[PDB]
Amino acid sequence: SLSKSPENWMSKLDDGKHLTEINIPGSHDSGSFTLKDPVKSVWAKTQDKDYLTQMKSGVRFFDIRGRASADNMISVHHGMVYLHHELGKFLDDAKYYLSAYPNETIVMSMKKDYDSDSKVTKTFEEIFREYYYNNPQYQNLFYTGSNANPTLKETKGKIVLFNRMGGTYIKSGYGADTSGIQWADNATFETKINNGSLNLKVQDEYKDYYDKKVEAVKNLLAKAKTDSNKDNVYVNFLSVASGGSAFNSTYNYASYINPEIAKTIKANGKARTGWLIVDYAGYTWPGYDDIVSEIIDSNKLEHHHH
Numbered sequence: 001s002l003s004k005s006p007e008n009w010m011s012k013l014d015d016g017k018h019l020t021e022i023n024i025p026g027s028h029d030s031g032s033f034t035l036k037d038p039v040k041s042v043w044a045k046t047q048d049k050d051y052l053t054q055m056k057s058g059v060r061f062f063d064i065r066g067r068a069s070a071d072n073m074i075s076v077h078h079g080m081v082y083l084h085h086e087l088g089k090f091l092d093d094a095k096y097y098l099s100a101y102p103n104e105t106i107v108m109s110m111k112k113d114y115d116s117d118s119k120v121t122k123t124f125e126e127i128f129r130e131y132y133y134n135n136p137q138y139q140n141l142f143y144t145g146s147n148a149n150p151t152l153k154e155t156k157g158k159i160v161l162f163n164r165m166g167g168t169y170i171k172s173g174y175g176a177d178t179s180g181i182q183w184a185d186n187a188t189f190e191t192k193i194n195n196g197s198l199n200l201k202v203q204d205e206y207k208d209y210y211d212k213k214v215e216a217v218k219n220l221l222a223k224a225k226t227d228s229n230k231d232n233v234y235v236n237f238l239s240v241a242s243g244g245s246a247f248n249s250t251y252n253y254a255s256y257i258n259p260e261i262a263k264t265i266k267a268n269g270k271a272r273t274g275w276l277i278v279d280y281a282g283y284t285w286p287g288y289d290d291i292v293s294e295i296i297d298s299n300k301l302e303h304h305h306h
């Protein structure tokens with residue numbers, strides 16, 4: 001049972017699977033574990049574990065949001081709020097992790113979350129491409145293959161870019177083309193990505209009240225359960241914005257939704273889920289089903305003789 005050993009669960013799958021076909025736990029605003037201020041954490045904090053611990057808990061999709069604070073520097077951010085570290089820290093942690101667990105792959109979403117400092121001359125995509133993706137420091141770290149729909153075998157030991165920066169000149173990863181990903185605001189939507197090779201289906205209704213959010217998540221989970229198309233990629237965000245008045249913290253919200261969705265997954269048996277992106281990945285509450293574990297265990301192991 002895969003969720004008992006979350007450190008190396010991908011290494012247990014058939015490596016011929018497309019990443020799209022693997023049920024992957026992701027963490028929303030992954031780098032926000034740095035916040036400790038109780039007032040701002042109500043709304044700005046979405047994770048309590050650091051990157052390495054999230055990886056050890058089985059998280060393989062990371063939602064990194066950035067701001068260029070100088071021409072050679074991307075700082076990790078929740079909108080205007082600095083999260084106390086730069087992109088190099090996540091890349092070093094993933095590198096160390098993928099070294100220790102060389103048959104896992106990590107998907108890293110990269111998005112601009114705030115306006116650059118006015119002294120910055122370069123676009124966010126130029127900075128990411130020149131100072132990180134092409135940095136010789138990260139030489140064997142990213143997926144650099146030409147397969148628009150790569151398999152686990154092809155991406156073992158690497159970070160596969162998931163591009164939310166807009167058009168890019170990077171040629172590997174999801175949305176790595178000059179058009180990027182057209183991302184609809186506060187919605188469930190579909191858009192063709194990678195010069196038309198893949199159909200990307202997103203639930204990102206980040207302003208929904210609880211009942212409407214649960215239905216949007218279940219709706220996309222139901223679509224996935226009956227869809228074995230390899231060229232369809234599902235990204236299903238359980239996270240919502242905390243609200244300044246409608247005070248129910250991201251943590252309170254996650255304590256409702258994560259177990260509710262975990263229980264539905266568990267009842268559906270082993271069936272395709274897509275990539276489910278959660279707040280407080282790995283945070284357990286006694287007597288509640290755990291969303292990360294149930295995502296992991298929803299992957300079907302075909303039984304071969306040894």
Ligand SMILES: O[C@H]1[C@H](O)[C@@H](O)[C@H](O)[C@@H](O)[C@H]1O
Nearest residue numbers: 028029183204206237239241
């Ligand atoms: O605040 C939201 C939220 O974090 C979403 O999941 C992200 O896709 C949106 O673009 C962002 O505006």
